[PDB]
Paper text:
Biuret hydrolase (BiuH) hydrolyzes biuret to allophanate and is part of the Isochorismatase-like hydrolase (IHL) protein family within the cysteine hydrolase superfamily. TrtA is a member of the isochorismatase-like hydrolase (IHL) protein family, similarly to BiuH, and has a catalytic efficiency (kcat/KM) of 6 x 105 M−1s−1, a KM for triuret of 20 μM, and exquisite substrate specificity. TrtA and BiuH are members of the IHL protein family that possess the catalytic triad comprised of a cysteine, aspartate, and lysine residue. Interestingly, the active sites of TrtA and BiuH are almost identical in sequence, and so it was hypothesized that triuret is the substrate for TrtA, funneling into biuret metabolism.
The triuret hydrolase (trtA) gene (NCBI accession number PKOI01000001.1) tested in this study comes from Herbaspirillum sp. BH-1, which was isolated from a biuret-fertilized potato field. To remove a possible intrinsically disordered region, a C-terminal deletion was made for crystallographic purposes. TrtA elutes as a dimer by size-exclusion chromatography, and the monomer adopts a fold typical of the IHL protein family with six parallel β-strands alternating with six α-helices (Rossmann-like) in addition to a two-strand antiparallel β-sheet at the N-terminus. Helices α6 and α7 provide most of the interactions between the two subunits in the dimer while α4 also has some contact at this interface. The α2 helix shows the highest mobility as illustrated by high B-factor values in the apo crystal and undergoes a significant conformational change (∼4.5 Å) when triuret or biuret is bound in the active site. The catalytic triad that has been previously defined in the cysteine hydrolase superfamily is present in TrtA. It is represented by residues D24, K129, and C162. Also present in TrtA is a cis-peptide bond in the active site between residues V157 and T158, which is signature of the IHL protein family. In the apo WT structure, beta-mercaptoethanol (BME) was found covalently attached to the catalytic cysteine of every subunit. The other chains in the biuret cocrystal that do not have biuret bound, as well as the apo WT crystal, are in the open conformation.
Author numbering:
A (entry chain A), B (entry chain G): 1 to 219
Protein backbone atom coordinates (compact mmCIF):
# COMPACT_ATOMS: atom_id res chain seq x y z
CA UNK A 1 0.00 0.00 0.00
CA UNK A 2 1.64 3.29 -1.21
CA UNK A 3 0.35 6.76 -0.10
CA UNK A 4 1.08 9.75 -2.43
CA UNK A 5 0.59 13.45 -1.55
CA UNK A 6 -1.87 14.57 -4.29
CA UNK A 7 -4.71 17.02 -5.11
CA UNK A 8 -7.36 17.04 -3.92
CA UNK A 9 -6.25 14.63 -1.10
CA UNK A 10 -3.76 11.71 -0.79
CA UNK A 11 -3.87 8.90 -3.43
CA UNK A 12 -3.40 5.24 -2.28
CA UNK A 13 -2.57 2.32 -4.63
CA UNK A 14 -0.98 -1.19 -4.65
CA UNK A 15 1.51 -1.72 -7.57
CA UNK A 16 -0.05 -5.20 -8.25
CA UNK A 17 -3.53 -3.67 -8.94
CA UNK A 18 -2.24 -0.43 -10.59
CA UNK A 19 -1.22 0.27 -14.22
CA UNK A 20 0.71 3.15 -15.86
CA UNK A 21 -1.13 4.43 -19.01
CA UNK A 22 0.97 6.61 -21.37
CA UNK A 23 -1.33 8.22 -23.93
CA UNK A 24 -0.36 9.07 -27.56
CA UNK A 25 3.37 10.00 -27.17
CA UNK A 26 3.63 9.80 -31.01
CA UNK A 27 6.48 11.15 -33.25
CA UNK A 28 4.14 13.23 -35.49
CA UNK A 29 2.76 15.20 -32.45
CA UNK A 30 6.14 15.82 -30.68
CA UNK A 31 9.09 15.91 -33.18
CA UNK A 32 10.35 19.09 -34.96
CA UNK A 33 9.04 19.12 -38.60
CA UNK A 34 6.54 16.26 -37.87
CA UNK A 35 2.77 16.89 -38.58
CA UNK A 36 2.17 18.83 -35.29
CA UNK A 37 4.62 21.65 -36.30
CA UNK A 38 3.21 21.69 -39.91
CA UNK A 39 -0.34 22.53 -38.57
CA UNK A 40 1.64 25.44 -36.89
CA UNK A 41 1.70 24.10 -33.27
CA UNK A 42 4.39 24.68 -30.60
CA UNK A 43 5.65 21.07 -30.04
CA UNK A 44 8.09 22.31 -27.30
CA UNK A 45 5.77 21.75 -24.27
CA UNK A 46 5.25 18.12 -25.49
CA UNK A 47 9.04 17.46 -26.06
CA UNK A 48 9.76 19.03 -22.60
CA UNK A 49 7.80 16.19 -20.78
CA UNK A 50 9.71 13.31 -22.57
CA UNK A 51 12.33 12.95 -19.74
CA UNK A 52 9.51 12.91 -17.08
CA UNK A 53 7.48 10.24 -19.02
CA UNK A 54 10.74 8.16 -19.41
CA UNK A 55 11.27 8.34 -15.57
CA UNK A 56 7.56 7.29 -15.03
CA UNK A 57 8.16 4.26 -17.37
CA UNK A 58 11.38 3.30 -15.45
CA UNK A 59 9.44 3.76 -12.13
CA UNK A 60 6.59 1.45 -13.41
CA UNK A 61 9.09 -1.13 -14.85
CA UNK A 62 11.15 -1.15 -11.56
CA UNK A 63 7.87 -1.55 -9.52
CA UNK A 64 6.85 -4.42 -11.84
CA UNK A 65 3.54 -2.58 -12.62
CA UNK A 66 1.50 -3.17 -15.83
CA UNK A 67 2.34 -0.59 -18.58
CA UNK A 68 -0.26 0.43 -21.20
CA UNK A 69 0.73 2.58 -24.19
CA UNK A 70 -1.92 4.14 -26.46
CA UNK A 71 -1.58 5.35 -30.08
CA UNK A 72 -4.33 7.35 -31.84
CA UNK A 73 -4.42 5.47 -35.18
CA UNK A 74 -6.58 4.06 -38.03
CA UNK A 75 -6.32 0.99 -40.30
CA UNK A 76 -4.49 1.96 -43.53
CA UNK A 77 -7.90 1.57 -45.37
CA UNK A 78 -9.46 4.20 -42.94
CA UNK A 79 -12.36 1.70 -42.36
CA UNK A 80 -12.30 2.46 -38.54
CA UNK A 81 -12.25 6.26 -39.11
CA UNK A 82 -15.70 7.97 -39.04
CA UNK A 83 -16.55 10.27 -42.01
CA UNK A 84 -17.22 13.09 -39.40
CA UNK A 85 -13.59 12.89 -38.19
CA UNK A 86 -12.15 12.91 -41.80
CA UNK A 87 -14.21 15.99 -42.83
CA UNK A 88 -13.94 17.94 -39.50
CA UNK A 89 -12.27 21.35 -40.27
CA UNK A 90 -11.75 20.59 -44.05
CA UNK A 91 -7.99 20.16 -43.37
CA UNK A 92 -5.46 20.65 -46.23
CA UNK A 93 -3.61 17.63 -44.70
CA UNK A 94 -6.31 15.24 -43.41
CA UNK A 95 -6.23 11.72 -41.91
CA UNK A 96 -4.55 9.32 -44.40
CA UNK A 97 -2.88 12.17 -46.43
CA UNK A 98 0.96 12.08 -46.84
CA UNK A 99 2.45 14.37 -44.14
CA UNK A 100 6.18 14.77 -43.23
CA UNK A 101 6.35 11.40 -41.36
CA UNK A 102 3.95 9.57 -43.76
CA UNK A 103 0.18 8.99 -43.72
CA UNK A 104 -1.44 11.04 -40.95
CA UNK A 105 -3.00 8.99 -38.07
CA UNK A 106 -2.37 5.65 -39.90
CA UNK A 107 -1.11 2.45 -38.18
CA UNK A 108 2.51 1.47 -39.09
CA UNK A 109 3.55 4.96 -40.43
CA UNK A 110 6.71 6.52 -38.81
CA UNK A 111 4.80 9.58 -37.42
CA UNK A 112 2.20 7.21 -35.84
CA UNK A 113 5.00 5.35 -33.88
CA UNK A 114 5.65 6.05 -30.16
CA UNK A 115 8.93 8.01 -29.50
CA UNK A 116 11.79 5.46 -29.35
CA UNK A 117 12.85 6.76 -25.89
CA UNK A 118 9.29 5.96 -24.50
CA UNK A 119 8.58 2.93 -26.77
CA UNK A 120 6.86 -0.28 -25.53
CA UNK A 121 9.00 -3.29 -24.37
CA UNK A 122 7.84 -6.95 -24.29
CA UNK A 123 5.12 -7.59 -21.64
CA UNK A 124 3.48 -4.13 -22.07
CA UNK A 125 -0.09 -3.61 -23.46
CA UNK A 126 -0.31 -1.48 -26.68
CA UNK A 127 -3.77 -0.08 -27.64
CA UNK A 128 -4.49 1.46 -31.08
CA UNK A 129 -7.59 3.66 -30.55
CA UNK A 130 -9.67 5.21 -33.36
CA UNK A 131 -10.91 7.97 -30.95
CA UNK A 132 -9.47 10.40 -28.36
CA UNK A 133 -10.71 8.17 -25.45
CA UNK A 134 -8.52 5.06 -24.82
CA UNK A 135 -11.62 2.97 -23.86
CA UNK A 136 -13.77 3.62 -27.00
CA UNK A 137 -13.69 0.77 -29.59
CA UNK A 138 -10.68 -0.87 -27.78
CA UNK A 139 -10.50 -3.87 -25.41
CA UNK A 140 -8.66 -1.74 -22.77
CA UNK A 141 -11.47 -2.12 -20.15
CA UNK A 142 -11.56 -5.96 -20.65
CA UNK A 143 -7.71 -6.27 -20.57
CA UNK A 144 -7.47 -4.28 -17.28
CA UNK A 145 -10.34 -6.35 -15.71
CA UNK A 146 -8.52 -9.60 -16.79
CA UNK A 147 -5.47 -8.27 -14.82
CA UNK A 148 -7.58 -7.10 -11.79
CA UNK A 149 -6.36 -3.44 -12.29
CA UNK A 150 -8.31 -0.91 -10.10
CA UNK A 151 -5.91 2.13 -10.18
CA UNK A 152 -4.33 4.03 -13.15
CA UNK A 153 -1.33 6.41 -13.24
CA UNK A 154 -1.95 8.57 -16.33
CA UNK A 155 0.50 10.48 -18.54
CA UNK A 156 0.77 11.64 -22.17
CA UNK A 157 -0.77 14.12 -24.61
CA UNK A 158 -2.69 16.10 -25.14
CA UNK A 159 -4.02 17.03 -21.62
CA UNK A 160 -7.39 18.54 -22.72
CA UNK A 161 -8.08 15.93 -25.52
CA UNK A 162 -6.79 12.31 -25.22
CA UNK A 163 -5.67 12.54 -21.53
CA UNK A 164 -8.92 14.23 -20.31
CA UNK A 165 -11.15 11.95 -22.45
CA UNK A 166 -9.36 8.74 -21.37
CA UNK A 167 -9.42 9.84 -17.75
CA UNK A 168 -13.16 10.78 -17.81
CA UNK A 169 -13.83 7.36 -19.46
CA UNK A 170 -11.76 5.52 -16.78
CA UNK A 171 -13.44 7.46 -13.91
CA UNK A 172 -16.93 6.37 -15.20
CA UNK A 173 -15.72 2.69 -15.41
CA UNK A 174 -14.77 2.68 -11.69
CA UNK A 175 -10.93 3.25 -11.95
CA UNK A 176 -9.04 5.44 -9.39
CA UNK A 177 -6.90 7.65 -11.68
CA UNK A 178 -3.81 9.74 -10.75
CA UNK A 179 -2.64 12.02 -13.62
CA UNK A 180 1.08 12.89 -13.28
CA UNK A 181 0.78 16.70 -14.02
CA UNK A 182 4.39 17.26 -15.21
CA UNK A 183 4.02 14.11 -17.49
CA UNK A 184 1.09 15.64 -19.50
CA UNK A 185 1.30 18.46 -22.10
CA UNK A 186 -0.93 20.41 -24.50
CA UNK A 187 -0.44 22.63 -27.58
CA UNK A 188 -2.45 25.14 -25.35
CA UNK A 189 -0.96 26.13 -21.94
CA UNK A 190 -4.38 27.45 -20.69
CA UNK A 191 -6.24 24.23 -21.76
CA UNK A 192 -3.54 22.13 -19.94
CA UNK A 193 -4.04 24.19 -16.73
CA UNK A 194 -7.89 24.39 -16.65
CA UNK A 195 -8.19 20.64 -17.55
CA UNK A 196 -6.03 19.64 -14.47
CA UNK A 197 -8.27 21.93 -12.30
CA UNK A 198 -11.48 20.40 -13.83
CA UNK A 199 -10.31 16.76 -13.28
CA UNK A 200 -9.81 17.26 -9.47
CA UNK A 201 -12.64 19.88 -9.01
CA UNK A 202 -15.53 19.28 -6.47
CA UNK A 203 -13.49 16.88 -4.23
CA UNK A 204 -11.88 14.93 -7.17
CA UNK A 205 -14.88 14.42 -9.48
CA UNK A 206 -12.68 12.79 -12.19
CA UNK A 207 -9.64 11.89 -10.06
CA UNK A 208 -6.30 13.06 -8.60
CA UNK A 209 -3.19 14.86 -9.88
CA UNK A 210 0.40 15.10 -8.50
CA UNK A 211 3.89 15.86 -9.92
CA UNK A 212 6.34 12.93 -10.60
CA UNK A 213 8.37 13.94 -7.47
CA UNK A 214 5.40 13.08 -5.16
CA UNK A 215 5.05 9.66 -6.88
CA UNK A 216 8.84 8.97 -6.55
CA UNK A 217 8.65 10.06 -2.83
CA UNK A 218 5.83 7.52 -2.20
CA UNK A 219 7.81 4.61 -3.79
CA UNK B 1 -30.98 20.69 -45.11
CA UNK B 2 -30.99 23.35 -42.32
CA UNK B 3 -27.86 25.55 -42.05
CA UNK B 4 -27.07 27.24 -38.63
CA UNK B 5 -24.48 29.98 -37.96
CA UNK B 6 -22.01 28.43 -35.47
CA UNK B 7 -18.40 28.28 -34.23
CA UNK B 8 -16.04 27.22 -35.69
CA UNK B 9 -18.04 27.23 -38.99
CA UNK B 10 -21.73 26.82 -39.97
CA UNK B 11 -23.44 23.53 -38.91
CA UNK B 12 -25.79 21.75 -41.38
CA UNK B 13 -28.26 18.98 -40.35
CA UNK B 14 -31.51 17.31 -41.48
CA UNK B 15 -34.24 16.92 -38.79
CA UNK B 16 -34.92 13.23 -39.81
CA UNK B 17 -31.28 12.27 -38.85
CA UNK B 18 -30.89 14.77 -35.90
CA UNK B 19 -31.67 14.26 -32.16
CA UNK B 20 -31.80 16.80 -29.30
CA UNK B 21 -29.92 15.42 -26.21
CA UNK B 22 -30.84 17.24 -22.91
CA UNK B 23 -28.33 16.07 -20.24
CA UNK B 24 -29.16 15.64 -16.50
CA UNK B 25 -31.69 18.55 -15.96
CA UNK B 26 -32.56 16.93 -12.57
CA UNK B 27 -34.21 18.53 -9.44
CA UNK B 28 -31.37 17.81 -6.90
CA UNK B 29 -28.87 19.65 -9.21
CA UNK B 30 -30.97 22.77 -10.03
CA UNK B 31 -33.76 23.43 -7.45
CA UNK B 32 -33.21 25.73 -4.40
CA UNK B 33 -33.09 23.42 -1.28
CA UNK B 34 -31.75 20.50 -3.43
CA UNK B 35 -28.60 18.40 -2.81
CA UNK B 36 -26.63 20.72 -5.16
CA UNK B 37 -27.48 23.77 -2.91
CA UNK B 38 -27.02 21.73 0.36
CA UNK B 39 -23.39 21.09 -0.84
CA UNK B 40 -23.01 24.95 -1.12
CA UNK B 41 -23.06 25.04 -4.97
CA UNK B 42 -24.84 28.15 -6.33
CA UNK B 43 -27.56 26.53 -8.53
CA UNK B 44 -28.82 29.92 -9.90
CA UNK B 45 -26.78 29.61 -13.16
CA UNK B 46 -28.42 26.13 -13.83
CA UNK B 47 -31.94 27.49 -12.99
CA UNK B 48 -31.22 30.47 -15.36
CA UNK B 49 -31.03 28.21 -18.51
CA UNK B 50 -34.37 26.32 -17.85
CA UNK B 51 -36.40 28.74 -20.06
CA UNK B 52 -33.73 28.45 -22.87
CA UNK B 53 -33.75 24.63 -22.54
CA UNK B 54 -37.63 24.58 -22.64
CA UNK B 55 -37.46 26.79 -25.82
CA UNK B 56 -34.90 24.33 -27.33
CA UNK B 57 -37.22 21.35 -26.41
CA UNK B 58 -40.28 23.12 -27.98
CA UNK B 59 -38.14 23.80 -31.16
CA UNK B 60 -37.11 20.07 -31.48
CA UNK B 61 -40.70 18.80 -30.77
CA UNK B 62 -42.19 21.20 -33.43
CA UNK B 63 -39.52 20.02 -36.01
CA UNK B 64 -40.43 16.37 -35.12
CA UNK B 65 -36.78 15.54 -34.18
CA UNK B 66 -35.95 12.62 -31.84
CA UNK B 67 -35.54 13.97 -28.25
CA UNK B 68 -33.25 12.06 -25.81
CA UNK B 69 -33.14 12.99 -22.05
CA UNK B 70 -30.44 11.67 -19.65
CA UNK B 71 -30.56 11.18 -15.87
CA UNK B 72 -27.43 10.42 -13.84
CA UNK B 73 -28.88 7.64 -11.65
CA UNK B 74 -28.28 4.29 -9.89
CA UNK B 75 -30.41 1.24 -8.95
CA UNK B 76 -31.63 1.50 -5.30
CA UNK B 77 -29.19 -1.34 -4.25
CA UNK B 78 -26.39 0.74 -5.96
CA UNK B 79 -25.17 -2.49 -7.74
CA UNK B 80 -24.42 -0.31 -10.88
CA UNK B 81 -22.44 2.28 -8.77
CA UNK B 82 -18.67 1.70 -8.62
CA UNK B 83 -17.25 1.82 -5.04
CA UNK B 84 -14.70 4.49 -6.29
CA UNK B 85 -17.67 6.79 -7.15
CA UNK B 86 -19.14 6.31 -3.62
CA UNK B 87 -15.88 7.06 -1.71
CA UNK B 88 -14.67 9.96 -3.92
CA UNK B 89 -14.35 13.21 -1.87
CA UNK B 90 -14.92 11.39 1.51
CA UNK B 91 -18.46 12.90 1.41
CA UNK B 92 -20.52 13.79 4.52
CA UNK B 93 -23.74 12.86 2.59
CA UNK B 94 -22.83 10.52 -0.30
CA UNK B 95 -24.63 8.55 -3.02
CA UNK B 96 -27.62 6.58 -1.60
CA UNK B 97 -27.68 8.64 1.66
CA UNK B 98 -30.92 10.59 2.37
CA UNK B 99 -30.63 14.16 1.02
CA UNK B 100 -33.16 17.04 0.97
CA UNK B 101 -35.04 15.36 -1.98
CA UNK B 102 -34.43 11.66 -1.12
CA UNK B 103 -31.55 9.16 -1.64
CA UNK B 104 -28.75 10.98 -3.59
CA UNK B 105 -28.41 9.77 -7.25
CA UNK B 106 -30.95 6.92 -6.79
CA UNK B 107 -33.61 6.04 -9.42
CA UNK B 108 -37.24 6.90 -8.48
CA UNK B 109 -36.29 9.58 -5.85
CA UNK B 110 -37.88 13.08 -6.19
CA UNK B 111 -34.34 14.66 -6.46
CA UNK B 112 -33.45 12.27 -9.36
CA UNK B 113 -36.42 13.44 -11.55
CA UNK B 114 -36.04 15.74 -14.57
CA UNK B 115 -37.59 19.23 -13.93
CA UNK B 116 -41.34 19.19 -14.76
CA UNK B 117 -40.62 22.30 -16.95
CA UNK B 118 -38.45 19.97 -19.16
CA UNK B 119 -40.30 16.65 -18.57
CA UNK B 120 -40.06 13.97 -21.27
CA UNK B 121 -43.25 13.22 -23.25
CA UNK B 122 -44.39 10.02 -25.04
CA UNK B 123 -42.07 9.04 -27.95
CA UNK B 124 -38.91 10.47 -26.28
CA UNK B 125 -35.94 8.33 -25.17
CA UNK B 126 -35.01 8.63 -21.49
CA UNK B 127 -31.52 7.31 -20.62
CA UNK B 128 -30.49 6.45 -17.04
CA UNK B 129 -26.64 6.50 -16.89
CA UNK B 130 -24.37 5.37 -14.03
CA UNK B 131 -21.55 7.71 -15.20
CA UNK B 132 -20.98 11.27 -16.47
CA UNK B 133 -20.89 10.17 -20.13
CA UNK B 134 -24.31 9.46 -21.73
CA UNK B 135 -22.78 6.58 -23.81
CA UNK B 136 -21.04 4.60 -21.04
CA UNK B 137 -23.09 1.53 -19.91
CA UNK B 138 -26.19 2.81 -21.87
CA UNK B 139 -27.86 1.61 -25.12
CA UNK B 140 -27.76 5.26 -26.31
CA UNK B 141 -25.31 4.59 -29.26
CA UNK B 142 -27.39 1.52 -30.40
CA UNK B 143 -30.70 3.47 -30.07
CA UNK B 144 -29.34 6.39 -32.26
CA UNK B 145 -27.78 3.98 -34.88
CA UNK B 146 -31.16 2.05 -35.03
CA UNK B 147 -32.95 5.40 -35.77
CA UNK B 148 -30.21 6.46 -38.30
CA UNK B 149 -29.15 9.53 -36.19
CA UNK B 150 -25.90 11.20 -37.45
CA UNK B 151 -26.31 14.73 -35.79
CA UNK B 152 -26.85 15.73 -32.11
CA UNK B 153 -28.02 19.05 -30.63
CA UNK B 154 -26.59 19.13 -27.08
CA UNK B 155 -27.88 20.96 -23.96
CA UNK B 156 -27.84 20.43 -20.20
CA UNK B 157 -25.59 20.43 -17.10
CA UNK B 158 -22.96 20.65 -16.05
CA UNK B 159 -20.99 21.99 -19.10
CA UNK B 160 -17.48 20.78 -17.99
CA UNK B 161 -18.67 17.37 -16.56
CA UNK B 162 -21.65 15.51 -18.19
CA UNK B 163 -22.09 17.80 -21.26
CA UNK B 164 -18.32 17.80 -22.12
CA UNK B 165 -17.97 14.03 -21.36
CA UNK B 166 -21.07 13.14 -23.48
CA UNK B 167 -20.00 15.41 -26.38
CA UNK B 168 -16.43 13.95 -26.32
CA UNK B 169 -17.91 10.38 -26.31
CA UNK B 170 -20.35 11.36 -29.16
CA UNK B 171 -17.49 12.88 -31.23
CA UNK B 172 -15.42 9.61 -30.94
CA UNK B 173 -18.52 7.59 -32.03
CA UNK B 174 -18.79 9.70 -35.25
CA UNK B 175 -21.71 12.07 -34.36
CA UNK B 176 -21.75 15.75 -35.48
CA UNK B 177 -22.54 17.68 -32.25
CA UNK B 178 -23.81 21.28 -31.91
CA UNK B 179 -23.82 22.34 -28.22
CA UNK B 180 -26.46 25.10 -27.68
CA UNK B 181 -24.25 27.36 -25.50
CA UNK B 182 -26.94 29.36 -23.59
CA UNK B 183 -28.77 25.95 -23.01
CA UNK B 184 -25.84 24.57 -20.89
CA UNK B 185 -24.58 25.79 -17.47
CA UNK B 186 -22.00 25.05 -14.75
CA UNK B 187 -21.59 25.81 -11.03
CA UNK B 188 -18.26 27.39 -12.23
CA UNK B 189 -18.73 30.06 -14.95
CA UNK B 190 -15.02 29.93 -16.06
CA UNK B 191 -15.30 26.07 -16.53
CA UNK B 192 -18.48 26.72 -18.65
CA UNK B 193 -16.76 29.32 -20.94
CA UNK B 194 -13.43 27.42 -21.31
CA UNK B 195 -15.23 24.03 -21.92
CA UNK B 196 -17.04 25.66 -24.91
CA UNK B 197 -13.65 27.00 -26.20
CA UNK B 198 -11.98 23.52 -25.84
CA UNK B 199 -14.92 21.68 -27.60
CA UNK B 200 -14.62 23.91 -30.75
CA UNK B 201 -10.77 24.33 -30.55
CA UNK B 202 -8.33 23.37 -33.40
CA UNK B 203 -11.05 23.95 -36.08
CA UNK B 204 -13.81 21.94 -34.28
CA UNK B 205 -11.90 19.03 -32.57
CA UNK B 206 -14.97 17.88 -30.50
CA UNK B 207 -17.78 19.77 -32.33
CA UNK B 208 -19.71 23.02 -32.89
CA UNK B 209 -21.35 25.57 -30.56
CA UNK B 210 -23.98 28.32 -31.12
CA UNK B 211 -26.59 30.25 -29.07
CA UNK B 212 -30.30 29.19 -29.29
CA UNK B 213 -31.20 32.37 -31.34
CA UNK B 214 -28.91 31.10 -34.21
CA UNK B 215 -30.67 27.67 -34.17
CA UNK B 216 -34.13 29.38 -34.04
CA UNK B 217 -32.96 31.48 -37.11
CA UNK B 218 -32.16 28.38 -39.25
CA UNK B 219 -35.64 26.87 -38.61
Amino acid sequence: MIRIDATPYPYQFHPRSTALVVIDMQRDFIEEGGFGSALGNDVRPLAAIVPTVAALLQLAREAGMLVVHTRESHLPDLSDCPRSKRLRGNPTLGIGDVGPMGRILVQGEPGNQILPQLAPVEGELVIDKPGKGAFYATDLHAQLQERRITHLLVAGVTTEVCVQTSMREANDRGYECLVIEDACASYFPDFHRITLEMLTAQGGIVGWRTPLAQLQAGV
